[PDB]
Amino acid sequence: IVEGSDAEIGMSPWQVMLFRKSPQELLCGASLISDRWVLTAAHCLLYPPWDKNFTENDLLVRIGKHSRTRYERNIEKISMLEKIYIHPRYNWRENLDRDIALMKLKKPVAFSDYIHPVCLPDRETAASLLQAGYKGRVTGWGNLKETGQPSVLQVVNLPIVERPVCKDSTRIRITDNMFCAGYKPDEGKRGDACEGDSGGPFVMKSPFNNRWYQMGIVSWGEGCDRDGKYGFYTHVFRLKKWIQKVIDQFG
């Protein structure tokens, strides 16, 4: 996360770290959506241009974390993966369209002060909140700048951007399964996701019921925190039918 700040303890209890077994290293962010299901970006698991193709046994998920590198004894919980599901129309060849994946845990995780699931949006909450100017929150242990790494989880609040502005900021083809967020050059403030934040959540707090909803998944950006560029996020609600199909069939 670029130009963010240290998270408060328990500020993002749905935050998940995808951790590579060997060598031991951060792979991506992710989020907890139930006691057995974790949501992330497809490109965290499958990205052939960079020779990335992880299988279940390659990874662990670490939940309840704050420190990036420490083993947080008595606080974090580490889970093995039962199965990975990648969206069947995930477009890694072109523009990361439908950049979404689910991971089922081998065993349910116990909720605690530090471990708790985020809500997924329904159509109405999506319609109400996914509006230009409305701000969401992005969290992760990714790099602090494009070209170092944080001691603890970082957080940044960013406004959703008008679709035509998103489109005009890039030569990449944008789709309805993406939205973009970030400040404009003229707005003074800044901030963005970066390498390592991939797969983490873009969340919003509904003013109607005071619950946090995951509206986006950290997907892509041209560099990190560049003037006139924006971060692009997978539109969770647009892909919720697939999410439900997977959970209903394999849950």
Binding site: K21, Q24, L60, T69, R70, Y71, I78, M80
Partner: peptide, 11 residues
């Protein structure tokens, strides 16, 4: 860079 995690999780 990362602290080693208990071996139980690597088996």
């Amino acid at each position: 860079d990362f602290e080693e995690i208990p071996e139980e999780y690597l088996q």
